[PDB]
Amino acid sequence: PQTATKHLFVSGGVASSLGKGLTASSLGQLLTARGLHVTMQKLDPYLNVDPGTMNPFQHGEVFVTEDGAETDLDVGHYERFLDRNLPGSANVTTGQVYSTVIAKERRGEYLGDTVQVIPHITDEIKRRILAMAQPDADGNRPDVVITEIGGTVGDIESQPFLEAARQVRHYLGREDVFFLHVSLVPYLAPSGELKTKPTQHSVAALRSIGITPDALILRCDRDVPEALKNKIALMCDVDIDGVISTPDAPSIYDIPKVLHREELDAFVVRRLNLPFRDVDWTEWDDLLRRVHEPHETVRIALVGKYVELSDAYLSVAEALRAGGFKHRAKVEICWVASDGCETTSGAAAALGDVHGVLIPGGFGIRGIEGKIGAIAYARARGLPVLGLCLGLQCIVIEAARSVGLTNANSAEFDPDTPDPVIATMGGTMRLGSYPAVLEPDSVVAQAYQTTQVSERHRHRYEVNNAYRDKIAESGLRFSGTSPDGHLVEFVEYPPDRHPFVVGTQAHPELKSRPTRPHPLFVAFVGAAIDYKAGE
Amino acid sequence: PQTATKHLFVSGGVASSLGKGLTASSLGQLLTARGLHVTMQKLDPYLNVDPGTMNPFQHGEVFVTEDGAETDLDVGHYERFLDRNLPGSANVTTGQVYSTVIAKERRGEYLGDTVQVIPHITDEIKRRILAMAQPDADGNRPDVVITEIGGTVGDIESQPFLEAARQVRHYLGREDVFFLHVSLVPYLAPSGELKTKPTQHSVAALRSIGITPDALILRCDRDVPEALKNKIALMCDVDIDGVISTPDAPSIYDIPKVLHREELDAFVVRRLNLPFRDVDWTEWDDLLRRVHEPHETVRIALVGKYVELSDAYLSVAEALRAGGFKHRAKVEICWVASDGCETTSGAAAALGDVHGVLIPGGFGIRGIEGKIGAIAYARARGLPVLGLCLGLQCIVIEAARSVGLTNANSAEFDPDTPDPVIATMGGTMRLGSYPAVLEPDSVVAQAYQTTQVSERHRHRYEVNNAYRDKIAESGLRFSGTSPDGHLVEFVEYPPDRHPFVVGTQAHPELKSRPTRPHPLFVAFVGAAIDYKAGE
Amino acid sequence: PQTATKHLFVSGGVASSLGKGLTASSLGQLLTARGLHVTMQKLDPYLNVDPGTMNPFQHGEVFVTEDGAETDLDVGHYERFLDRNLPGSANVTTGQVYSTVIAKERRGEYLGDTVQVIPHITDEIKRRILAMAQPDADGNRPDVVITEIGGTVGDIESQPFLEAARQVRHYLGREDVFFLHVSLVPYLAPSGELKTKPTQHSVAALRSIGITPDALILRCDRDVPEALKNKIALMCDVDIDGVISTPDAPSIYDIPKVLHREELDAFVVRRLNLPFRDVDWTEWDDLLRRVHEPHETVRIALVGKYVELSDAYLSVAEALRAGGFKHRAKVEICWVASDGCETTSGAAAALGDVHGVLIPGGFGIRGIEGKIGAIAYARARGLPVLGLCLGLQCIVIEAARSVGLTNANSAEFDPDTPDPVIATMGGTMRLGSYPAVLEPDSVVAQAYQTTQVSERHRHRYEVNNAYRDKIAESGLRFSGTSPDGHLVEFVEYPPDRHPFVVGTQAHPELKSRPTRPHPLFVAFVGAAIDYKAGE
Ligand SMILES: Nc1ccn([C@@H]2O[C@H](COP(=O)(O)OP(=O)(O)OP(=O)(O)O)[C@@H](O)[C@H]2O)c(=O)n1
Ligand SMILES: Nc1ccn([C@@H]2O[C@H](COP(=O)(O)OP(=O)(O)OP(=O)(O)O)[C@@H](O)[C@H]2O)c(=O)n1
Ligand SMILES: Nc1ccn([C@@H]2O[C@H](COP(=O)(O)OP(=O)(O)OP(=O)(O)O)[C@@H](O)[C@H]2O)c(=O)n1
Ligand SMILES: Nc1ccn([C@@H]2O[C@H](COP(=O)(O)OP(=O)(O)OP(=O)(O)O)[C@@H](O)[C@H]2O)c(=O)n1
Ligand SMILES: Nc1ccn([C@@H]2O[C@H](COP(=O)(O)OP(=O)(O)OP(=O)(O)O)[C@@H](O)[C@H]2O)c(=O)n1
Ligand SMILES: Nc1ccn([C@@H]2O[C@H](COP(=O)(O)OP(=O)(O)OP(=O)(O)O)[C@@H](O)[C@H]2O)c(=O)n1
């Protein structure tokens, strides 16, 4: 039988860039491995109502849920570590709260009461939090909700969320609410010692707003001496079980071992009185083997538009590497800047060194001819290609230009093109999960091993249905469509035209999990390994 | 069976002069009435090592324990409300802590370690606190120690005591430590409403140092509306059982009823899990009757040296009134300034209106001839007299001068007197409890109904043992002595010389309790009532 | 003409071990180079009244002023960087304040007033501070007093000093008081960026007690980007002239260049309106040349009792290196643990690799036979020796044992010795500066180039004046004495017995300055270089 849904807030002190996200994700992973139905939530502090306005080349990708809600990329780590789909409710922001309360004000639904910050805003936040305890579409209720509070304790940027957390702690009571806390432990080079004083000043600032931390996670470049853990337990009044060393791990997938080796999760389960059951590593030891024991290295070029910040492609890169792990191959990514590839001599100079090329999406970018040139090169050179979203549109433009439709373009990039092979259906902006059907015994059907698939979408332009028969003169099969056949979903060249050249409009990288890689990235790495073996 | 000795700290916020002392005393009274063995402690913040240096005309009397320890007058309220003797350990000060730790430093008992404030000072304070849990001379261990932290939360004056309280709360755990808190609720006259915001800012300041208050006592001139108690429970995270209204009571003896009518003590007993048993009021309803239903008013003049601050005589005045309550009489005190009474015309102008005159002590004052003049008048007029300590020395000087020893004096006030009837035995400064013996069937023996008594002392001058036979020529009997007869303890005139004129060297006001008045003050009020009846 | 003496407080935030001492010393150096008469003061937080109780093997040496006041070793850096003698007033501690105020309380000099912490303590601290503005023994008044506040801002350990600083800032006014501030800027390895948030939280904590910092010194492992200096000036309201980068310098003597290259001192002079004059580097460029361009490396063994903490010998090591700089030689110190040298085979195994051996002091240690063995070896091997204080007593014991006084000892280490060549005169504990006279044309007289010297002392045992003629049978000349000849001050072997073997009772390392090395350490390094050249 299930008790009340516990809440487990996480807040950062001293500094940002300490890994609250991956730490909370790893805690969710461990609780999942015990068999609890964990779910997760992020409370972003910024006022953007949704991230579709944000420049991804500075703030990373935009994740898309099943229900087509745009969310912070941080939600991706929670999905990947849980292997669970999360609702669009998983990402609250200050912008959603303030614009909700001001909308209800203008519509007059507060009966003319004065709209204070307290209680109206903090009750709305508390409601957005407690909604996660509601039963899912199957009627199951989660055991634990982990809620990463954004910003830093003491930021004016976060005070309303921490007042809401305080109120939740009042109404549910300490049997059912737990606070983790994450804080920096700097190393000083002239003296050669770890200093706890910033963590004491952090927990003092946290207590000044009425939250009591039940455990500390100490972020450090070396294992914290027991002689400092005891001092922290003295000066923070944190039970000495709950001062946890957490070095900088070798890789993000090692962090669950770090947290388990300090036995954090056993203390969490004991403190919340959740149904205690043994951890089974059998699902994750094999991952750590594949991660640490690569049989071979294989290089994939990724033809990004701008590549000085790699975080703009995080989930693409992680989906590639998750594919690599399926073949026990260390996928290494050659970050290739598309604007170097607009000339075939530059394309040859960049791309000739690799065993495959991948065309990632690029919603909202301008100027794609570099990607088309890179694809035309890769076809002539025989390099395997996968095109994610804009990737399919560049592949289709390349195919049409190969059959002489020289001025062919997307209506997005040349509204005056005489041959809009990609055109607006601004037309219906498709978002979220839609069904698709595969040509039976197509190459994609051979990969998925089924005719029925579903994918997450974020595009408003489509293959012009009048051109399908013309484009098929290239040999390009339209090997998947909408169930009515009205919309194009996949394209491929035949197996004897090229070994593997596929595109989709989807973002298949969003269905990646390291224990369950996406079929197309597995097949693409299989083709890249076969190219390595043949060359 | 007895569990661990619980601790119950009390700290003030917003302001001083809020009645932490009488509130904590009344809580001790209620817990005593349940039958728990309560004991109490004050942690003064000032650096005076003992108060014997302090000017009592600005800071009130100096209390004296059984073991002769000088303590703050605040200890008197705890003794009176408990009716229990307290050790000299009942009053810690910062001066005792800092001078102890620096003494152990100079004696080298820290093995050359650096003497920080933490942990050395706060461990010493914690030791001075936990000492109260040690078994008494009978081997009984108290159930509850109530510890009034001096100053205000947020004073630099108190930070080390609050860090010590935090450490105690860590080592004993919240099952065994409770915090009361006392805070002001101002009334604003232009708007006519109570404001809780100062109490919120107080509990925020208290939390900033890591103490969590379990209940609030709200100090207000009117009953706090339930609509503000709920807001305080919301904004302070104080369980709504534990927000307690406490109006300004009519008198200090009514405060136990106030605390019981809001049912504070039931919540304390439930929260500490003490052995629950019913309150019996039978001991205190009769006090409240006597306090509120006086049959008659009787006036006593008290011949103080300086009287603009009455707190210098607190325990004298309270012992008088406790005597009054024994005869159901409202004792009203005519505060008479001794320097008006040095001339017989001024003495007649001041003292003629009253039914008795009392000569209080005056350790460390200069110039006493006003008191001698007042006594000579009172004798001629027939007014009953009691002399406390210096009172006996003025009575004895008056007696000697009445038998012509005209230049007789105390060696304290004229070291060059040719007739030191009071002289140094600086000689042995007597402090604390000493036995004395009474002349059988003396007037004092008729009052005490026994030959054996004990009293608390604070004097270094004594009746000159060579003059006893000479002074007895006045008829003044030396009706009590040390058991060896070496020292004078009491004097009286015979019943047919005057109705009641007695002195002692003792401070009998320190053995006052309202449920157990001191015998001499009962007899003195009996004589003053008989004078009222006869006149 | 001279205006009022300015005050320049310095306080640390975020962490200790950030170099407030050397930073403030370097600021004093720069202001001295401009020609201002700077003086300095340390306000230690610990309650040790003087450090003579402290274990130096954990807290470093004890410095000794001209007037024989024991002070924290931190005073040594101020003396060395100023090249000025400082009074014993240069080191206040909480122990001196609290024991002073409690002494005046017990002596009754507060007229019975209650001794609060405020104002009595903080007025005493303010008085101890303002005393530094009083004219010196020549009647000159310093222009600037630099006052390093100990502990960290927000420590209960320091609150009274910061309240005193606030009061001084009130009474003198912001024209005449300046606050530096020192704060950490951590580097985070996973993200690769400097984080300013701990400095913002520091300056917030500092402002919460009413001090406004006029400049920030940022302590970092790399030059702070201008893009973070501007953010700090925004969020701290620090004038952007006054956010100063300070990397970890290569050596302590380079820090004046760091502070001058960021032009801190020009801003300080402009802000305090001191008499502006150009910096002259001519005194310090030659030091930095000698420091960075060593012609040769020469190794000196230092025979310490315990050597795992080198800070116990700080001023000895610095005096050696200052001697090295006089010959342009990199002195490298072989830290030799004396207990390895008690056997001649172990002595040979340790000491044979070096060009000289030095016997440092050791007040309060037990067991010296290792040092005697090391000296007997060094004599047989011909290694140059210098004995500081206990060094002379080991040299003298070795000399006496070489002439067959086999059971000779110091009365300190064998009170039952039949031959106390070193004996109590506990006798007079000599402290501070005393005159001494040198044998004309002695080797020491050839070094000092004068007959008259003075030295700082800290010993209570002396050469037994009855044994001088007996010990001189070794050839050991008693080449210096008290001016009356009563006390032994120096010993030497003749130039043809050994090249240079000298001892003293003094601590000559305390008169070291890098621009003015002590004559004996120059001569000793000259002899060690001559041994290197000959071997
Ligand atoms: N136990 C941890 C914690 C953090 N990191 C490193 O810290 C970086 C930060 O990644 P992230 O969790 O996403 O935090 P940020 O995006 O940088 O900033 P924020 O704290 O707001 O989440 C990661 O690259 C990760 O390698 C790590 O290796 N191990
Ligand atoms: N809440 C606190 C914490 C520390 N101190 C004082 O700060 C000094 C110690 O300085 P510091 O070394 O910098 O802090 P640590 O406790 O020792 O931890 P860390 O090593 O990280 O510095 C001690 O005198 C200690 O009493 C204090 O008064 N109040
Ligand atoms: N529930 C209360 C609390 C306080 N008082 C009044 O508050 C005054 C303060 O007396 P005391 O307890 O001794 O406090 P102070 O001496 O004035 O100052 P402090 O708080 O430091 O004890 C008393 O006269 C008392 O009448 C009261 O009548 N009822
Ligand atoms: N911790 C708090 C407490 C109050 N407020 C805000 O302060 C305003 C109320 O002002 P005020 O009346 O002065 O405080 P009250 O809560 O109403 O209590 P009181 O009547 O004593 O004033 C409200 O907007 C409330 O949201 C806040 O932002 N944060
Ligand atoms: N601008 C600076 C500041 C500090 N340090 C290094 O920091 C160390 C600290 O020395 P010190 O000034 O004496 O400080 P601590 O003794 O370690 O501790 P505290 O802050 O209390 O003085 C020194 O070894 C020094 O090399 C430095 O190289 N350059
Ligand atoms: N006094 C302040 C300081 C910062 N913030 C908020 O904190 C967030 C920035 O987080 P962070 O990067 O960690 O602090 P920085 O100012 O950017 O400095 P640093 O790089 O060291 O982190 C911003 O939303 C900013 O508005 C705030 O609300 N109040």
Q: DSSP secondary structure string, C427-438?
A: ---EEEEEEEEE
Other C-beta atoms within 10 Å of C39: how many? 25
**Rounded-to-integer distance, Cα C527 and Cα C516, Å:** 19
Q: A231: nearest CA in chain B?
A: B119
| C83 phi-psi bin (left φ>0, alpha ψ -120 to 50, beta other) | left
| A17 contacts in chain C (CB < 8 Å) | 188, 190-191, 193, 195
- Under an 8 A CB cutoff, do A191 and C221 touch? no
Q: Tell me which DSSP letter residue C5 carries.
A: P
Contact A299, A353 (CB under 8 A): yes
Tokens of B172: 């004993």
Name the 3-class secondary structure at A28: helix
| B414 phi-psi bin (left φ>0, alpha ψ -120 to 50, beta other) | beta
Cβ-defined contacts of C132-140 (< 8 Å, 24+): C132/C5, C132/C39, C132/C41, C132/C89, C133/C4, C133/C5, C140/C37
Question: Which numbered ligand comes closest to the C-alpha of B43?
Answer: 3
Q: Which of B45, B53, B160 sits opposite C108 (nearest CB)?
A: B53
What residue spans of A83-158 are helical by DSSP H? 94-106, 120-130
Give yes or no for residue C195 CB within 6 A of ligand 6: yes
- Under an 8 A CB cutoff, do B47 and C99 touch? no
- Scored b (16 or more CB within 10 A) or e, A413-432 reads beeebebbbbbebeeeebbb
Give yes or no for residue B195 CB within 6 A of ligand 4: yes
Residues belonging to chain C:
535
CA distances from C142 to C66, C89, C93, C131, C533 (A): 18, 14, 22, 11, 47
Cα R_g (chain C), whole angstroms:
25
The string of DSSP codes covering C443-465 is: HHHHHHSSSEEEEEEEESEEE-T
Name the 3-class secondary structure at A195: coil
Q: Whose CA is nearest to atom 16 of ligand 1?
A: A17
Contact status of C111 with chain A (Cβ, < 8 Å): no
The residue ranges of DSSP E strands in B73-200, in sequence order, are 91-93, 144-152, 177-184, 187-188, 193-194
Other C-beta atoms within 10 Å of C110: how many? 17
Task: Name, in order, each residue with C-beta under 8 angstroms of B267's C-beta and a sequence gap of 6 or more.
Answer: B215, B241, B242
Task: Name, in order, each residue with C-beta under 8 angstroms of A458's C-beta and a sequence gap of 6 or more.
Answer: A62, A64, A361, A363, A389, A430, A431, A507
- Residue A322 host element (H or E): helix A314-326
According to DSSP, the residues that pair with C424 across neighbouring strands are: C461
**Rounded-to-integer distance, Cα C430 and Cα C461, Å:** 9
CA dihedral A18, A21, A22, A27 (to 10 degrees): 120
Other C-beta atoms within 10 Å of B227: how many? 8
Pairing of strands C215-220, C243-247: parallel
Nearest C-alpha neighbor of C255 from the set C81, C90, C509, C74: C81
Question: Which numbered ligand comes closest to the C-alpha of A259?
Answer: 1
The residue ranges of DSSP E strands in C307-390, in sequence order, are 329-337, 357-359, 385-387
The ligand 5 atom nearest the CA atom of C16: 20
- Between helices A314-326 and A519-534, what is the axis angle to 10°? 60
Pairing of strands B70-72, B187-188: unpaired
Contact status of C152 with chain A (Cβ, < 8 Å): yes
Q: Which of C17, C188, C201 sits opposite A190 (nearest CB)?
A: C17
Scan for tokens 């929670």, then name that residue. Answer: A78
**Rounded-to-integer distance, Cα B290 and Cα B517, Å:** 13
Burial, B403: exposed, middle or buried (Cβ in 10 Å; 0-12, 13-18, 19+)? middle
Give yes or no for residue B18 CB within 6 A of ligand 3: yes
Q: What phi, psi does A509 have (nearest 5°)?
A: -65, -20
- Scored b (16 or more CB within 10 A) or e, C439-474 reads beebbbbebbeeeebebbbbbebbbbeebeeebeeb
Would residue B236 show up in a list of annotated catalytic residues for this protein? Answer: no
**Rounded-to-integer distance, Cα C157 and Cα A360, Å:** 58
- Residue A64 host element (H or E): strand A62-64
Task: Tell me the torsion sign for CA atoms C247, C253, C257, C260.
Answer: positive
Q: C198: nearest CA in chain A?
A: A14
Tell me which of C70, C398, C489, C509 is the catalytic residue: C509
Tally: H helices and E strands in chain A: 18, 23
Residue type, B499: P
Q: Which of A197, A204, A248 sits opposite C14 (nearest CB)?
A: A197
SS (H, E, C) C123-150: HHHHHHHHHHHCCCCCCCCCCEEEEEEE
Task: Name, in order, each residue with C-beta under 8 angstroms of B160's C-beta and a sequence gap of 6 or more.
Answer: B94, B97, B117, B121, B122, B125, C156
**Rounded-to-integer distance, Cα A12 and Cα A43, Å:** 12
**Rounded-to-integer distance, Cα A178 and Cα C482, Å:** 74
Other C-beta atoms within 10 Å of C23: how many? 23
SS (H, E, C) B506-528: CCHHHHCECCECCHHHHHHHHHH
Q: Where is the binding site for L-glutamine, in residues of A?
A: 362, 390-393, 412, 460
Tokens of A414: 């040349």
Determine what percent of chain A falls in helix, strand and coil, rounding each to the nearest 5.
40, 25, 35
Nearest C-alpha neighbor of A488 from the set A472, A512, A505: A505
Tokens of C485: 């000849």
Nearest C-alpha neighbor of B503 from the set B517, B513, B493: B493
Contact B359, B327 (CB under 8 A): no
Give yes or no for residue A452 CB within 6 A of ligand 1: no
Residue type, A101: V
The string of DSSP codes covering C201-265 is: HHHHHHHTTT---SEEEEEESSPPPHHHHHHHHHHH---GGGEEEEE--SSGGGHHHHHHHTTHH
The residue ranges of DSSP E strands in B363-418, in sequence order, are 385-387, 408-410
Burial, A268: exposed, middle or buried (Cβ in 10 Å; 0-12, 13-18, 19+)? buried
Question: Which subunits have 3 or more CB–CB pairs within 8 Å of chain A?
Answer: B, C
Q: C57: nearest CA in chain B?
A: B112
**Rounded-to-integer distance, Cα A320 and Cα A517, Å:** 9
**Rounded-to-integer distance, Cα B451 and Cα B464, Å:** 23
| A213 contacts in chain B (CB < 8 Å) | none
- Beta strands across the sheet bearing A91-93: A91-93, A38-44, A144-152, A6-12, A177-184, A215-220, A243-247
Contact C160, A207 (CB under 8 A): no
Q: What phi, psi does A402 have (nearest 5°)?
A: -65, -30
Contact A177, A129 (CB under 8 A): no
**Rounded-to-integer distance, Cα C535 and Cα C533, Å:** 6
Method: cryo-EM
Contact status of B16 with chain C (Cβ, < 8 Å): no
The string of DSSP codes covering C55-123 is: -HHHH--EEE-TT--EEETHHHHHHHHHT----GGGEEEHHHHHHHHHHHHHTTTTTT----STTHHHH
Name the 3-class secondary structure at B478: strand
Min Cα separation A146/chain C (Å): 24
Tokens of B192: 């006519």
Q: What phi, psi does C353 have (nearest 5°)?
A: -90, -5
**Rounded-to-integer distance, Cα C448 and Cα C442, Å:** 10
Task: Tell me the torsion sign for CA atoms B509, B514, B518, B523.
Answer: positive
Would residue C507 show up in a list of annotated catalytic residues for this protein? Answer: yes
**Rounded-to-integer distance, Cα C519 and Cα C513, Å:** 11
- Residue B398 host element (H or E): helix B390-402
Would residue B389 show up in a list of annotated catalytic residues for this protein? Answer: yes
Pairing of strands A243-247, A452-459: unpaired
Contact B172, B147 (CB under 8 A): no
Give resolution in angstroms: 3.6
Residue type, A110: Y
Tokens of C266: 């020009």
**Rounded-to-integer distance, Cα A477 and Cα A506, Å:** 17
**Rounded-to-integer distance, Cα C319 and Cα C519, Å:** 10
Q: Where is the binding site for CTP, in residues of B?
A: 16, 155-157, 195-200, 231
Tokens of C201: 């939280």
Task: Name, in order, each residue with C-beta under 8 angstroms of A177's C-beta and a sequence gap of 6 or more.
Answer: A6, A7, A8, A9, A168, A169
- Residue A480 host element (H or E): strand A477-481
**Rounded-to-integer distance, Cα A178 and Cα C26, Å:** 49
Pairing of strands B177-184, B215-220: parallel
Contact C6, C177 (CB under 8 A): yes
**Nearest 5 degrees, angle CA C41-CA C42-CA C46?**
155
Biggest CA–CA distance in chain B, Å, is: 77
Task: Name, in order, each residue with C-beta under 8 angstroms of A209's C-beta and a sequence gap of 6 or more.
Answer: A153, A159, A162, A163, A166, B204
Contact status of C366 with chain B (Cβ, < 8 Å): no
Residue of B48, B121, B155 best to disrupt the C interface, most CBs of C under 10 A: B48
Q: For chain B, how far is it from start to end, CA to CA, in angstroms?
A: 59
- Residue B268 host element (H or E): helix B264-272
Question: Which subunits have 3 or more CB–CB pairs within 8 Å of chain B?
Answer: A, C
- Residue A521 host element (H or E): helix A519-534
**Rounded-to-integer distance, Cα C517 and Cα C526, Å:** 13
Q: What phi, psi does B248 have (nearest 5°)?
A: -65, 115
| A170 contacts in chain B (CB < 8 Å) | 234, 237
Question: Which numbered ligand comes closest to the C-alpha of A46?
Answer: 6
Scan for tokens 């007093």, then name that residue. Answer: C145
- Residue B454 host element (H or E): strand B452-459
The string of DSSP codes covering C485-510 is: S-SEEEEE--TTT-S-EEEESS-GGG
- Scored b (16 or more CB within 10 A) or e, B235-256 reads bbbbeeebbbbbbebeebbebb
Q: Tell me which DSSP letter residue B131 carries.
A: G
Min Cα separation C333/chain A (Å): 19
Tokens of A475: 């040999």
- Under an 8 A CB cutoff, do C195 and A15 touch? yes
**Distance from the alpha carbon of residue B60 to the mean position of ligand 1, in angstroms:** 63
Tell me which of B327, B498, B509, B518 is the catalytic residue: B509
Residue type, C264: L
**Rounded-to-integer distance, Cα A351 and Cα A333, Å:** 12
Contact C320, C333 (CB under 8 A): yes
